[PDB]
Amino acid sequence: MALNIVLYEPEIPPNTGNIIRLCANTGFRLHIIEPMGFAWDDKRLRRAGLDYHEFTAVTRHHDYRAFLEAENPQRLFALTTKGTPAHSAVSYQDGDYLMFGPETRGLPASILDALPAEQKIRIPMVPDSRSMNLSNAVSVVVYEAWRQLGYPGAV
Amino acid sequence: MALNIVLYEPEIPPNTGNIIRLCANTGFRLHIIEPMGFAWDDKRLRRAGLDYHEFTAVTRHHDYRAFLEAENPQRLFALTTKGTPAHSAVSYQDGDYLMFGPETRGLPASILDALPAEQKIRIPMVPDSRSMNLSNAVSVVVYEAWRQLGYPGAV
């Protein structure tokens, strides 16, 4: 199984820590587009108690263009409140990359405009909802994609 | 829609803060079984930036028996690594209560033994996985239940 999570300029250490654990638990690979809002050395990152092996799921990319050149994503989805289909209304498949913006801002227009409407997904919410925690949102999208594929690799 | 999340003796403030936001975003109601590992006044709880209205989704119960007497749950599910069906392999319905143990321990045997095997659910994971963050786990179960019901109340 090849499913990928992409974090664009993540800002808050414990969110990234949680998402690393999430990838380790699901077999998803993690891609980080620099710069991050914190150092890898940050004490808040590994409060998670992350093992050495868990970091082998993580690849760093200097910028978005470098990410595209290294990974050549076959399909790139972006989570955005501006999206149209629900995260569960699309059909994920091997090779997909699922991209998320920073905790305090959306993904840049220059990226969002490169994607067709059907690849910009949104997590359903009640009217007048507030922002969801980023690691929560990634967990929801990841587990929904993994569900659709029948949880390959799970015990 | 009447779906309920139950936290048994939650320990870590930001997890509960995130789960409160989660309930506000989904229309789920939150039930807390005391005692908590932190005070409501805890600075770490509202780093979340929780609005006053969001706290109206929360009811506190002095202990598990008091919870049962006040709520009279029609069906009670428990998330446990010991569970048998996946969280997505059961069929949620109006009136369900979804119960979660503390971040650093399972739910007590005296509660788990009261539940049939089919009501003890587990989130799928790869072999040799480590513990999932509690707010991540609740988000996954909540969004899966809400998906099954067709996201009633979502914009």
Numbering used by the authors:
A (entry chain A), B (entry chain B): 0 to 154
Please share text taken word for word from the publication where this structure appeared:
The enzyme responsible for 2′-O-methylation at the 34 nt wobble position of the isoacceptors and in E. coli was recently identified by mass spectrometry and designated TrmL. However, there is a group of minimalist SPOUT members, which contain only the catalytic SPOUT domain and lack the extension domains. Our results demontrate that the minimalist SPOUT Mtase EcTrmL functions as a homodimer by engaging residues from both subunits to bind tRNA. The overall structure of an EcTrmL monomer subunit is composed of six β-strands and six α-helices, in the order β1-α1-β2-α2-α3-β3-α4-β4-β5-α5-β6-α6.
By solving the crystal stuctures of EcTrmL in apo form (2.0 Å) and in complex with S-adenosyl-homocysteine (AdoHcy, SAH) (2.0 Å), we identified the cofactor binding pocket and the potential active site. The space groups of apo EcTrmL and EcTrmL-SAH were P32 and P21, respectively. Structurally, the dimer is formed in a ‘perpendicular’ mode, i.e. one subunit (green) is rotated by ∼90 degrees with respect to the mirror molecule of the other subunit (cyan). The N-terminal half forms a Rossmann-like fold, which is common among SAM-dependent MTases, whereas the C-terminal half forms a deep trefoil knot. The knot is formed by threading the C-terminus (residues 121–157) through a hoop composed of residues 78–86, which forms a hydrophobic core that stabilizes the polypeptide knot. EcTrmL contains many basic amino acid residues, comprising 13 arginines (8.3%), three lysines (1.9%) and five histidines (3.2%) in a total 157 resides, most of which are located on the protein surface. SAH binding does not significantly affect the overall structure of EcTrmL.
